[PDB]
């Protein structure tokens, strides 16, 4: 829409803002302080719209994305 000149900050901010509002990552919030959320597999599953087996596994059991030990996040 702006082939030759910079995108005005107004339009860039409003568009990035509304697109940002559109995104939502499947997750189950928890109390234990040791958990981390597997951002890679979360956003990846979201991008394929939860069709690949990792996407299915995630849309069915979002709690799988939480991990204490970093490696076990994937082993699970």
């Amino acid at each position: 829409k702006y082939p030759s000149k910079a995108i005005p900050a107004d339009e860039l901010i409003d568009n990035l803002h509304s697109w940002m509002r559109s995104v939502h990552l499947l997750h189950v919030r928890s109390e234990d302080n040791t958990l981390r959320y597997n951002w890679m597999l979360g956003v990846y599953a979201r991008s394929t719209n939860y069709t690949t087996p990792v996407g299915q596994l995630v849309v069915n059991a979002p709690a799988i994305l939480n991990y204490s030990n970093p490696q076990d996040a994937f082993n699970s």
């Binding site: 690949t52 087996p53 990792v54 299915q56």
Partner: protein
Amino acid sequence: QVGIPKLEVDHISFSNVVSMMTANIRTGDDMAVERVNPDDVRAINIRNA
């Protein structure tokens, strides 16, 4: 002492052990199976393997 291999030397030997299969073996026979097609085509997954 181990014996000399027969192919190692130039003499002809006319009595030799040959391994062979008894009736219990059989090979090259067609074998039967039970194929079981997937219950739904939409439930199959291709990636990520």
